[PDB]
Amino acid sequence: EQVFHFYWLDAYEDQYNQPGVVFLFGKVWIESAETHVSCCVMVKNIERTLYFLPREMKIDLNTGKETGTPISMKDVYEEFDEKIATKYKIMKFKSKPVEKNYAFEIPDVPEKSEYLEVKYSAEMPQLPQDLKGETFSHVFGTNTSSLELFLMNRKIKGPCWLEVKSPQLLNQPVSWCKVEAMALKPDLVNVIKDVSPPPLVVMAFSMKTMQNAKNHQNEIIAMAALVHHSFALDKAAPKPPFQSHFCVVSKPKDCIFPYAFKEVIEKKNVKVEVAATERTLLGFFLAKVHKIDPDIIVGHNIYGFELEVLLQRINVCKAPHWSKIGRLKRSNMPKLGERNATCGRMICDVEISAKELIRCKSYHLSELVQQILKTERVVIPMENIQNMYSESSQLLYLLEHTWKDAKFILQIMCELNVLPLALQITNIAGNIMSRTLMGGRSERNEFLLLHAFYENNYIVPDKQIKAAYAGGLVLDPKVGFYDKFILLLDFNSLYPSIIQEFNICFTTVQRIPELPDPSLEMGILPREIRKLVERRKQVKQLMKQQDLNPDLILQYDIRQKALKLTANSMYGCLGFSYSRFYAKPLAALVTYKGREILMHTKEMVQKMNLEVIYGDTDSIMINTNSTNLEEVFKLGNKVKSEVNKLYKLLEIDIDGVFKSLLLLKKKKYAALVVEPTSDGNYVTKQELKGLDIVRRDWCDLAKDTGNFVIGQILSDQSRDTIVENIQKRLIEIGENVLNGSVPVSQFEINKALTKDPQDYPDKKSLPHVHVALWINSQGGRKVKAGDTVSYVICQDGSNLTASQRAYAPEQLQKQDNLTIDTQYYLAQQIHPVVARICEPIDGIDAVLIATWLGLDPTQ
DNA sequence: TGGTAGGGGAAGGAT
DNA sequence: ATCCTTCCCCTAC
């Protein structure tokens, strides 16, 4: 009618096949149906914003020498209209002088200058980025995308409500959405802020595949999906997290179903669809996605395998209307990039989201359900699924398996709160939520700065087509065991505070660059960090209120977590070499100040006649030689106030006291963290950092025994009795290994691949790659980059190195000639872990520990 | 398609 | 054989 109000969620831009158009996809309220439906708004006529920086004097391009003719704003306009717009076939365009700010990597560019803003249609040819001219030295905005221009010009900071003044009917239906509208010019789209976000339609799904006998390509056997139609991002997840479901199952070419599938299913009353051929199955799933019309599709291992196979089978089987997997009608699918295949619908891979929120040995679905959902997952081998087609009782269990997998995925998504958190991360950064779910953290802070400099009238850098600088300072530790109270001080968010304290920005230094006059106004980068900290503070104050909605404290918690996660990732965007806002000088300047701030702090504490024993990037550990917390906390604040007297915004605080400390090496120690109580007298928990028992590349047999040793060293017992308890247990573990009392899960060590196992220089050298190649030889799910492979080295009767004798745990039970190397774990795993832990404590030796396990003492 | 600093292991030369 | 550098993966900040 007069206006069109909708809540945008995703955007799609086709740079090559349709330039200057940005498709928006979101929700809109239909009062007649009393439900939100999917809508697609087509924003047309996105201009090409260019900026020509005029030279001081007109020079000839061939000679490159000064001709002595001054360059004016009319002369630079002449060269474009005469020699540039004609040579590159730019018929119609616009021109207007403007003043833009700049503070980035291109040299010989003033901070403030007069540029020639030129706007023309995106359907016209694009200029070269390195274009030079007789009147202008450089040109910006050459390859700026339509989506970027639209999001910046209209201040679209994340998913929000938009009004579309003067909406237009679409000639032919371009989208798979319920409602469609068109915008003539980007100026017709504004941001509405006083409206609550709408619930979303979420669909988590899973699928089971199988390799064909003739061709090695996969084949979709069964798919299941759970749907919830009012999944709110503003509050907790619904219980149950799904309202409806559908399950599909088909046959391969040379396979037929067990008897009476329909009747038995009709008898079981389970809502299961039977497809004759796989092509019939895919058409059913596409039509279900089209009718459900979800905003977010959830699954596991989507980009690595599942989505790539789904598109491939649809292409092979020639299933009609492939583009229904997204929301925009398209004639042909891209080659399998390919992330822009489900445009209009967000893709959530729980295995990817888990890698950003939690820490696990392996991030496959089976391991996630064991750690998050506290329930075991049974997986069907890809070799036994062919025999599962013999009896329907074995095949109906196959559907129930994948159907239960879809529920696990949906349950994992809810427990991690990835949807409510991703929206907050997107509304803070001001990017696209689909990119937040999948893309890295670099693209987010890239958008946060692209907005910040657009707000302040800056020309942002164009999108480009060992280490590199010094980092933190780790003081050398005073190795040993400490019986007295150890005090730990550190600076909260040092690098963000360093930026504010010293006004470090692209604009404040002459980037080589050194800190500016403290009288200078706060730069753009520090002022943005100041906002996030102030915003996080205000949210913290809101959590203090009483008589408040119990659902708000959970949402306020999600928000304040996002504010910190954004402010802390700001530094990393400066050191990333492929970052749009790459500034290695600024990154080195920050890290240098951190070292100087730490070094000056350590020397200040030493001048106070205090002994510092360890210090990492921002922390300092002080040995007090006192057993009274009244004097430790008094001395804790005395050092605190003395340090904070030097910095305006940077502050240091007590991070806890240590009852006992086992400081082994750099970044490796164990302590008993003092926790204050209402009684005024502490209770202690242990903290493990850097020790081999904390890592995941050591077996659980050595990590559990080492954790028992750490508990004995930090214990409040006599020195003569601690060594007795370790002896009695270290000889016991040496007996249960050869006796077989310990499970096989205690012998597996986990290492992940940083590249493809075939792309390694030598696979027989590294153990985990040799096991990865064996998994890739089987029919089971492949092991690609980033995947963690658990392996158990065995005894195959060969005198090859213990690393060359590395096998998979599944090979130990299958092959009877592979047995657990008993002497290896007692000498190469359990011994060095316990030996390095007991190195500073007097009494336990390396050879004495080896004699306890039961091996030839040579140490 | 955040960073550097650092430990602990094994491979692969050179000797 | 041993010494040494290189590469590997995982950590702490």
Residue numbers in the entry: 338 to 673, 680 to 808, 836 to 881, 898 to 1245
Sentences from the paper on this structure:
This complex assembles short RNA-DNA primers which are subsequently extended by the processive Polδ and Polε. As such, the Polα catalytic subunit encounters two types of DNA substrates during the primer synthesis: an RNA:DNA helix that is handed over to it by the primase subunits and then a DNA:DNA helix during subsequent DNA synthesis. Crystal structures of the catalytic subunits of Polα, Polδ, and Polε reveal a characteristic B-family polymerase fold comprised of a palm domain that carries the catalytic residues for dNTP addition, a fingers domain that drapes over the nascent base pair, a thumb domain that makes contacts in the DNA minor groove, and an N-terminal domain (NTD).
The catalytic core of hPolα (residues 339 to 1259 of the p180 subunit) was crystallized with a 13-nt primer DNA/18-nt template DNA from a mix containing Mg2+ and dCTP. There are four polymerase-DNA (binary) complexes in the crystallographic asymmetric unit. Unlike the ternary (polymerase-RNA/DNA-incoming nucleotide) structures where the fingers domain is draped over the nascent base-pair, the fingers domain in our structure is in the open conformation. When compared to the human Polα ternary structure, the fingers domain in our binary structure is rotated outwards by ~22°. Intriguingly, the templating guanine base is rotated about its glycosidic bond to the syn conformation. It is stabilized in this conformation by stacking interactions with the side chain of Arg784 from the NTD. Strikingly, the portion of DNA:DNA helix in contact with the polymerase has a mixed A-B conformation while the portion of the duplex outside of the contact region remains in the standard B-form. By contrast, the portion of the DNA:DNA helix outside the contact region remains in standard B-form. This suggests a model where Polα imposes a hybrid A-B-like conformation on the DNA:DNA helix rather than any major rearrangement in the polymerase to fit a B-form DNA. Almost all of the contacts noted previously with an RNA primer are preserved with a DNA primer. The Polα catalytic core binds the two substrates with similar affinities, namely with a Kd of ~320 nM to the RNA:DNA helix and with a Kd of ~430 nM to the DNA:DNA helix.
